[PDB]
């Protein structure tokens, strides 16, 4: 710091229902995918484990870094069950 991506990752498990969004939004900062806002009452809020500024590296073994958020949107819409996120916390 300030250079380089640091010495920590955070792994979180969150339950997603079929065909219902987890209730978090994402944006790109270039290749990266960053949690932006949280839906009130949704699975992400209830978990307390996803926050603004968290960078999503991987979900369930899928490399998320480098994807446009339009691609991430489509991928997550096809997922359910326990999702394991690998994050760089804000």
């Amino acid at each position: 710091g300030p250079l380089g991506s640091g010495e920590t990752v955070k792994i979180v498990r969150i339950e997603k229902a079929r065909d219902i969004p987890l209730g978090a939004t994402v944006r790109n900062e270039m290749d990266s995918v960053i949690i932006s806002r949280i839906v009130k009452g949704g699975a992400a809020e209830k978990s307390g484990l996803l926050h603004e500024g968290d960078e999503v590296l991987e979900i369930n073994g899928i490399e998320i870094r480098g994807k446009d958020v339009n691609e991430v949107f489509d991928l997550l819409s096809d997922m359910h069950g326990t999702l394991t996120f690998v994050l760089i916390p804000s």
Binding site: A24, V26, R27, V39, N70, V72, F73, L76
Partner: peptide, 14 residues
């Protein structure tokens, strides 16, 4: 100001 500022990043729901 309305012209030098960077535009908002696109946001998508997951």
């Amino acid at each position: 100001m309305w012209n030098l500022m960077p535009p908002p990043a696109m946001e998508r729901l997951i």
